[PDB]
Amino acid sequence: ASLVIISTLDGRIAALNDGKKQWDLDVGSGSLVSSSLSDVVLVGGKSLTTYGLSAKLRYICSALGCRRWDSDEEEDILLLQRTQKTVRAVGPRSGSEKWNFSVGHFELRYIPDLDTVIKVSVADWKVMAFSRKGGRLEWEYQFCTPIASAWLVRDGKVIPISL
Amino acid sequence: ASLVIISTLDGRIAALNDGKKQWDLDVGSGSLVSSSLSDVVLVGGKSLTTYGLSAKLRYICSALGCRRWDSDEEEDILLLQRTQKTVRAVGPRSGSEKWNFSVGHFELRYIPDLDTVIKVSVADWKVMAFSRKGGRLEWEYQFCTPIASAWLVRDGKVIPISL
């Protein structure tokens, strides 16, 4: 087929003449950004994990190891990794946390086994699909959450659909 | 009092005319270094945690929060943080891990509420205590594991006893 991948602010990945959704899968990492307020010591940690998707969770490889799932079909493959920076501030007196924040993002790689164009209206979080003229609209997908990152995955590679 | 703190390769912290041991406490992080062998994707993550010690675990603050313990006595305080870098290599085909390795270290800060000198023979992992002349030996502590980092904590600060 030929689909579009979308990384949103809530930390969500979605995939789409239509733009219908085929699947939307997330990870236990929450939003791609967070903040708070409640001499200091500061704790933290970045983490680059990796999620093996089909076109489905077959494995999750991280800095500790892998968690796998059953079933088969060979088949297709879609690499997906999550980079989550994180750091809290904490009073040396006692772990009372003055404040905290964290940022994150996804990146995409593909592993293997009639055109129009796509632009993303970040103002209204639209995924717009046009045509040729210039260009005439064909469809658009609206997300109920700010779009962080997006790519175009047709053939078997990954063009990053820019802001 | 007046004591000497020692960070060893196994990821262990120890404290010592004597050099007797008053306490030796560790964390669930294993050795300060590790390695292995079994186009690649690479997972990883650094983590800077913090351990609140007395002179005892009262709290462990990390990038996720705190775990505390009971009892009281005010009292004394000894800040101790662990920085653990870690990264595995993993085949894009499937999380089979081509290899992996990790490094780590501790650093010390003090929070409050007749001399001789100390050198560390890294060759035989000795903690040597001398005197004045020159200098004559008074005692030595031998560790059954390579010494990574060491400090001198007398008054209420931290001089790093060098290699």
Side-chain angles (χ1 to χ4, degrees), chain A residues 1-19 22-23 25-45 47-55 57-66 68-72 78-87 89-97 99-112 115-131 134-135 137 139-153 155-163, chain B residues 1-19 22-23 25-45 47-55 57-66 68-72 78-87 89-97 99-112 115-131 134-135 137 139-153 155-163:
Chain A
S2 43
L3 84 176
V4 172
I5 312 301
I6 301 95
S7 177
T8 57
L9 250 275
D10 47 8
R12 175 145 65 91
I13 305 300
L16 327 168
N17 297 23
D18 37 30
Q22 310 330 99
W23 64 268
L25 162 137
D26 277 23
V27 309
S29 302
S31 169
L32 280 186
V33 76
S34 295
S35 175
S36 290
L37 192 102
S38 63
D39 181 47
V40 291
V41 186
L42 69 171
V43 294
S47 60
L48 199 142
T49 73
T50 300
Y51 303 94
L53 270 266
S54 69
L57 268 188
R58 313 173 246 158
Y59 79 95
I60 297 180
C61 241
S62 68
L64 234 183
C66 287
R68 280 202 174 83
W69 286 267
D70 212 345
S71 186
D72 47 23
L78 192 69
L79 209 280
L80 184 56
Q81 119 276 345
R82 163 72 168 278
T83 314
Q84 192 72 15
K85 323 241 213 82
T86 299
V87 36
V90 33
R93 60 181 68 85
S94 68
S96 206
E97 181 239 29
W99 47 262
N100 76 83
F101 86 99
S102 79
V103 303
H105 59 255
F106 291 84
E107 293 175 5
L108 219 172
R109 216 191 207 169
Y110 184 85
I111 348 92
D115 46 33
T116 66
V117 297
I118 318 290
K119 175 165 178 30
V120 180
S121 175
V122 195
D124 200 311
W125 314 328
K126 313 178 178 327
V127 172
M128 295 161 151
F130 292 90
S131 65
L137 328 69
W139 60 266
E140 51 164 322
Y141 203 105
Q142 184 148 320
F143 288 82
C144 309
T145 162
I147 297 170
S149 312
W151 306 264
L152 189 272
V153 188
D155 39 26
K157 49 91 226 81
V158 277
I159 140 87
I161 299 183
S162 293
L163 42 89
Chain B
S2 43
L3 84 176
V4 172
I5 312 301
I6 301 95
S7 177
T8 57
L9 250 275
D10 47 8
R12 175 145 65 91
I13 305 300
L16 327 168
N17 297 23
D18 37 30
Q22 310 330 99
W23 64 268
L25 162 137
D26 277 23
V27 309
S29 302
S31 169
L32 280 186
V33 76
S34 295
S35 175
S36 290
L37 192 102
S38 63
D39 181 47
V40 291
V41 186
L42 69 171
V43 294
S47 60
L48 199 142
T49 73
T50 300
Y51 303 94
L53 270 266
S54 69
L57 268 188
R58 313 173 246 158
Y59 79 95
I60 297 180
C61 241
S62 68
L64 234 183
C66 287
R68 280 202 174 83
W69 286 267
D70 212 345
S71 186
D72 47 23
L78 192 69
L79 209 280
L80 184 56
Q81 119 276 345
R82 163 72 168 278
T83 314
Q84 192 72 15
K85 323 241 213 82
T86 299
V87 36
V90 33
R93 60 181 68 85
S94 67
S96 206
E97 181 239 29
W99 47 262
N100 76 83
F101 86 99
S102 79
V103 303
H105 59 255
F106 291 84
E107 293 175 5
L108 219 172
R109 216 191 207 169
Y110 184 85
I111 348 92
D115 46 33
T116 66
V117 297
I118 318 290
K119 175 165 178 30
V120 180
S121 175
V122 195
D124 200 311
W125 314 328
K126 313 178 178 327
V127 172
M128 295 161 151
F130 292 90
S131 65
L137 328 69
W139 60 266
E140 51 164 322
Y141 203 104
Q142 184 148 320
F143 288 82
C144 309
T145 162
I147 297 170
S149 312
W151 306 264
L152 189 272
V153 188
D155 39 26
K157 49 91 226 81
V158 277
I159 140 87
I161 299 183
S162 293
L163 42 89

